[PDB]
Design a protein around this ligand. Structure first.
Ligand SMILES: C[C@@]1(c2ccccc2)OC(C(=O)O)=CC1=O
Lengths: 56, 337, 215, 285, 233
């Protein structure tokens, strides 16, 4: 009732007072991180069978 | 009072306007010139046998060699993925288990389900056997997920629209999270083990704060129940998989939606979502017995992990990113590579 | 080409496999029944005849039954109903004395419609229990039945019951080609419900065996 | 010098008979093998028994070329020792291999229906394989009676490649037919009667699947009787006429002989009916 | 707590027979493999026999093969070693050692109390040449053990163990698989090295740890102990 509405409006007010970065910048660092660790992904680039623990 | 009819609406309008203003372009436009990953081939390297009922959950150890699985037959097996051996076999008190977890230190495992009780087992005992160490109670609904923060704390999500943080020794609920208006089905922990997100049947996800215990942000956009969630390795994004045959990737800082992964030929829901070590591959488990991998930056199906005879209910990727293990309702675990 | 420790680990794994196989063989010989109802519909009477999930164990004619009660779950029913996809039968309990109270008959009918037409319970047979015979008779011989079903057109007697009630309940099952529905009246003192449950279980097991054989 | 088969009819009447037999049995059992090989991969005890029966059918259907041409060449043939000695043996193993498996299948169905709670209804695939191997061993043991005894089955009248040479020689191969057609029969008849009686008493016949099972179980017995009766009838008939008169006479052992030839012709309506009497229960079409 | 107690010693005439029993209480006896280790008066340790879990695998030392028999009694938690045709060279104190094998386990964890026996009237070889090292407390000491054949298996494990026996006490496990530290052992000890050459290091030396140190292999089931080095002063 009254308590539920008060809690909801307080939560919405708290959520609305946050700082958000631009979407393009978030995409930029997401792509940068995804590209930086490209070589440490055996799943992406198949690993040579010499060092494949699950050979089978 | 009538205030819920106007202040709530105007605050929602302000949130929508802020999100729209903060949106300039899409992720696809940025990653339009990125070289495609290409076709990906995976083969069934191993196959673990011994379960006699549908498998509902699994978890990889921190050494990327040991894993634990749960099934309806009331058994909790700990496998050795390198040699397909059975290190342990714990008999459960109640066979209605729908979740499991592995401690980061490798000392404890956890399980829960329709009994509304989360049980914690001890693996390093002087008596040589595995015995239950603590039984946590206090939830009023079926427990769907549980993740270990450390050897001393654990977070759980149940069907009573609440999430709680426990203290293992005392057994009391240190903090309780409220705000969802539907069953909470899954949760994931941030790499720094300070924040976590939960996916509920309310067709929405929230970002909590373990320290003080209040909701920080709310993400909407889906159209049905959410059955899985997973954090991006960076820790500033997460992916959700709902029942309307759609996987989506949100970003915490932008507080918006980045991409949706849908295909016209897919009509079944997603039961599990996981990422790769570098975050370039997104793996999802569907109800059509398959398991598609998606280019996380281009939304292009790069491969199919076919070879299961029933619904895929769990999915996991090792810490070193060397293997993928899937479990289905036909009581078979397969470690792809 | 293995070492001593590897061979010992393999032996331990084989012993674990043997124990798992024995436990599965022992568990596969039991009969699982799922109990449903509309609440305070006589489930207590049924369970006395012989937080979360409540399990009951009873034996009849050297057969081990397991009975699951899901009355303790207020959450959504479509998120965990698929767990009981392998139950051999479903026991449904309805109180015949709730026909003129607050309407509950319609709620029971809606629940029966939802349960009987689920995509998971496409094969599993359902056993229907109707309770409170004496009190229901005492009520109908005074209060008319037209209040709860306006479309009813018949005399006011017990013989009219078991008609327009059990037939209409069986009419909700628009999948008559695959699964059968058994109805059986019961009351506080009958001492024969276990026999009916055993007969239904034997019929279901015979059908399952014939299906498995391919015949 | 045991009296010869002076008919000159079988070699021109039986050819097309043993002939289509080829086509029907081969196509049916080949389709059965194709379905069983890489289309189900989910086997059970009854599936194992049916597969064993199909293999026993295959062996005869591939050993049929010889008899077809042999008599087609007017009771004359070709190479002497090894081929006929093997061809004759490969068979009894097929015949005595189906007679056992039909009874096994009938007993299995009886146990599934009449006693639905008996533990025998749920056995491991390993146990089924063990029993199947044991039964295969048993039938091989019974049929091994002719292993390398060549002087009689092969003896040169310039053309004989037969074994049941109407004569008086009592051992096993002979005794086999008398009992190996009643022990089986009695068991199948008893099982079929009990299945029908029980499945009808418990008020289940109105179900379509139950009705289909009721027809099929009786069809199995009917086919078994129709196929395997005439050979045994001719055998008891020739024994009767053997005991009434002289052993070496054969002035009355001719019509009964030609009968044996055509009567044996019947073994395969079953060999080729196997594909239709079984595996037709729940086809995916 | 966990403890193993055994008895059955005494004086036996040559050529006779005697039956030994090990009483185990405080742990899951059915899930543990049981060894049998002897010790001559002043001639170190020596492996004798072994029985696996479920009695599905039994090995014997070549010296006592045929004469000795080892059996276990799971329901009543008792380990039996029946021996016949005893000879004068068998006079030694015997021990009762448990061991459980799985990925990451710690074999040879707990050692029995020990019973004495008296009598009236391949085969990897290690060298522990150094015998006496008198060092004052507070310093650091090193121990060396060398194997004839390399102890590094294909899978990467190095099956070498270290044992310590304080005076008038049962031997205690220190290091397993050449690098791991046994539970309940202070972090002062540290074992390292390579194949065919191993060493143990003590950082800071104090009192209750003076005794005899032994090294052992676990590659092929004939087990061999070292000669034994001891610390004086
Ligand atoms: C007499 C026999 C035959 C017929 C032609 C050539 C050889 C043998 O007919 C049977 C049979 O029908 O199964 C097996 C035989 O030994």
């Amino acid at each position: 009732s009254i308590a539920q509405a008060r809690k909801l409006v307080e939560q919405l007010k708290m959520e609305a007072n946050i700082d958000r970065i631009k979407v393009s910048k978030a995409a930029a660092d997401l792509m940068a991180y995804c590209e930086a660790h490209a070589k440490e992904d055996p799943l992406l680039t198949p690993v040579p069978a010499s060092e494949n623990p699950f050979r089978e | 009072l009538d205030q819920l009819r106007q202040e709530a609406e105007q605050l929602k309008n302000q949130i929508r306007d802020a999100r729209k203003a903060c949106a300039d372009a899409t992720l696809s436009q940025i990653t339009n010139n990125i070289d495609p990953v290409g076709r990906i081939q995976m083969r069934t390297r191993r196959t673990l046998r011994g379960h006699l009922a549908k498998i509902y959950a699994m978890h990889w150890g921190t050494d990327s060699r040991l894993l634990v699985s749960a099934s309806q037959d009331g058994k909790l097996i700990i496998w050795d993925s390198y040699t397909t051996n059975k290190v342990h076999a714990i008999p459960l008190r109640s066979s209605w288990v729908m979740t499991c977890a592995y401690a980061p230190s490798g000392n404890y495992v956890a399980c829960g389900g329709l009994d509304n009780i989360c049980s914690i087992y001890n693996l390093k005992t002087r008596e040589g056997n595995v015995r239950v160490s603590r039984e946590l109670a206090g939830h009023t609904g079926y427990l769907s997920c549980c993740r270990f923060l450390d050897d001393n704390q654990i977070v759980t999500s149940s069907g009573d629209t609440t999430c709680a943080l426990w203290d293992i020794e005392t057994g009391q609920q240190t903090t309780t999270f409220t705000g969802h208006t539907g069953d909470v089905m899954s949760l994931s922990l941030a790499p720094d083990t300070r924040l976590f997100v939960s996916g509920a049947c309310d067709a929405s996800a929230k970002l909590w704060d373990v320290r003080e215990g209040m909701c920080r942000q709310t993400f909407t956009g889906h159209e049905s129940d959410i059955n899985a969630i997973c954090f991006f390795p960076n820790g500033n994004a997460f992916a959700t998989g709902s029942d309307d045959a759609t996987c989506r990737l949100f970003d915490l800082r932008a507080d918006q939606e980045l991409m949706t992964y849908s295909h016209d030929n897919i009509i079944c829901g997603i039961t599990s979502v996981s990422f790769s070590k570098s975050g370039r591959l997104l793996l999802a488990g569907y109800d059509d017995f398959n398991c598609n991998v998606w280019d996380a930056l281009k939304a292009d199906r790069a491969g199919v992990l076919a070879g299961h005879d029933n619904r895929v209910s769990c999915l996991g990727v090792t810490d070193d990113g060397m293997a993928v293990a899937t479990g289905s309702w036909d009581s078979f675990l397969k470690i792809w590579n | 080409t293995l070492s001593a420790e590897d061979k010992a680990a393999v032996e331990r794994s084989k012993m674990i496999d043997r124990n798992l196989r024995e436990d599965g063989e022992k568990a596969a010989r039991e009969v699982k029944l799922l109990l449903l109802g509309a609440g305070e519909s006589g489930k207590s009477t049924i369970v006395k005849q012989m937080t979360g999930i409540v399990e009951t164990h009873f034996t009849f004619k050297d057969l081990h039954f397991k009975m699951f009660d899901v009355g303790a779950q207020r959450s959504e029913r479509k998120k965990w109903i698929h767990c009981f996809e392998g139950v051999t039968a479903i026991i449904f309990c309805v109180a015949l004395s709730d026909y003129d109270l607050v309407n509950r008959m319609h709620e029971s009918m809606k629940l029966f419609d939802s349960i009987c037409n689920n995509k998971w319970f496409t094969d599993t047979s359902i056993i229907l229990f109707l309770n409170k015979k004496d009190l229901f008779e005492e009520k109908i011989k005074k209060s008319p039945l037209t209040i709860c079903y306006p479309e009813y057109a018949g005399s006011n007697t017990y013989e009219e019951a078991a008609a327009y009630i059990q037939c209409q309940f069986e009419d909700l099952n628009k999948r008559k080609d695959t699964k059968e529905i058994y109805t059986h009246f019961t009351c506080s003192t009958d001492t024969k419900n276990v026999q009916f449950v055993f007969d239904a279980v034997t019929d279901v097991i015979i059908k399952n065996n014939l299906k498995d054989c391919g015949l | 010098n045991c009296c010869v088969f002076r008919d000159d009819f079988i070699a021109k009447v039986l050819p097309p008979v043993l002939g289509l037999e080829f086509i029907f049995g081969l196509l049916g059992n080949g389709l059965a093998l194709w379905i069983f090989c890489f289309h189900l991969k989910s086997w059970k005890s009854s599936r194992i028994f049916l597969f064993n029966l199909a293999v026993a059918d295959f062996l005869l259907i591939i050993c049929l070329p010889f008899v077809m041409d042999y008599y087609v060449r007017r009771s004359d043939w070709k190479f002497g020792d090894i081929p006929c000695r093997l061809v004759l043996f490969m068979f009894a193993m097929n015949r005595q291999g189906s007679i056992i498996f039909l009874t096994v299948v009938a007993v299995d169905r009886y146990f599934r229906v009449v006693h639905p709670h008996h533990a025998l209804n749920k056995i491991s695939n390993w146990t089924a394989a063990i029993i199947s191997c044991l039964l295969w061993g048993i039938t091989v043991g019974l049929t091994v009676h002719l292993l390398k005894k060549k002087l009689l089955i092969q003896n040169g009248t310039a053309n004989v490649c037969i074994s049941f040479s109407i004569c008086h020689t009592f051992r096993w191969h002979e005794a086999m037919f008398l009992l190996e057609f009643f022990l089986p029969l009695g068991i199948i008849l008893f099982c079929s009667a009990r299945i029908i009686w029980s499945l009808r008493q418990r008020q289940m016949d109105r179900h379509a699947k139950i009705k289909r099972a009721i027809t099929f179980i009786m069809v199995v017995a009917i086919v078994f009787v129709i196929c395997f009766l005439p050979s045994v009838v001719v055998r008891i008939h020739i024994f009767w006429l053997l005991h009434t008169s002289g052993t070496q006479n054969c002035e009355v052992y001719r019509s009964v002989d030609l009968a044996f030839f055509i009567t044996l012709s019947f073994t395969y309506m079953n060999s080729m009916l196997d594909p239709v009497v079984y595996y037709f229960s729940s086809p995916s079409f | 707590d966990v403890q193993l107690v055994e008895s059955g010693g005494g004086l036996v005439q040559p050529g006779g027979s005697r039956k030994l029993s090990c009483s185990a209480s405080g742990f899951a006896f059915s899930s543990f493999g049981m060894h049998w280790v002897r010790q001559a008066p002043e001639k170190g340790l020596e492996w004798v026999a072994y029985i696996s879990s479920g009695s599905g695998t039994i090995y014997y030392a070549d010296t006592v093969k045929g004469r000795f028999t080892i059996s276990r009694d799971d329901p009543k938690n008792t380990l039996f070693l029946q021996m016949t045709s005893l000879r004068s060279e068998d006079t030694a104190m015997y021990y009762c050692v448990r061991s459980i094998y799985y990925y990451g386990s710690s074999p040879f964890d707990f050692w029995g109390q020990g019973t004495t026996l008296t009598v009236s009237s391949s085969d990897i070889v290690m060298t522990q040449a150094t015998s006496s090292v008198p060092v004052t407390p507070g310093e650091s000491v090193s121990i060396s053990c060398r194997s004839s054949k390399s102890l590094l298996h294909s899978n990467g494990n190095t099956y070498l163990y270290w044992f310590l026996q304080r005076p008038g006490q049962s031997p205690q496990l220190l290091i397993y698989r050449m690098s791991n530290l046994a539970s309940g052992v202070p972090d002062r000890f540290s074992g390292s090295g390579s194949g065919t050459a191993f060493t143990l290091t003590i950082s800071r030396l104090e009192a209750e740890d003076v005794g005899v140190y032994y090294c052992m292999q676990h590659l092929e089931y004939p087990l061999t102990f070292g000669a034994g080095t001891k610390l004086e002063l």
